[PDB]
Design a protein that fits this description.
This is part of a larger assembly, with 2 copies of chain A.
Chain A lengths: L13 E10 L2 E9 L16
Antiparallel strand pairs in A: 1-2
PDB class: protein binding
Keywords: MERS, spike, antibody, protein binding
Entry title: MERS S ectodomain trimer in complex with neutralizing antibody 111 (state 2)
Chain lengths: 50, 49
């Protein structure tokens, strides 16, 4: 029902969409999880003033 | 000799096996409760921590 606004216990990593399919004696759950797979480091400034 | 020994050993073995089954059942219940608690702990780490 909701992609975000809840902790992603249902979907590993950031969760974009989930699709459900029937399973024998139950329901199978499929989720989409974004994986960064890279790390680039840049200096961060905490806001600006004038 | 053998006749009395087999009788007493058999009842002791049967009682031990039933007691072991009860111990195994308690372990299975404990493992199931642990699995539920572990999922709750993972959820707390994911959001509250």
């Amino acid at each position: 029902k909701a992609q975000s606004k809840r902790s992603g216990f249902c979907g590993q990593g950031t969760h974009i969409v989930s699709f459900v399919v029937n399973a024998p004696n139950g329901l199978y759950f499929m989720h989409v999880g974004y994986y960064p797979s890279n790390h680039i480091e840049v200096v961060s400034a905490y806001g600006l003033c004038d | 000799d053998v006749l009395e020994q087999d009788a007493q050993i058999d009842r002791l073995i049967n009682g031990r096996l039933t007691t072991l089954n009860a111990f195994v059942a308690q372990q299975l219940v404990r493992s199931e409760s642990a699995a539920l608690s572990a999922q709750l702990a993972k959820d707390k780490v994911n959001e509250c921590v």
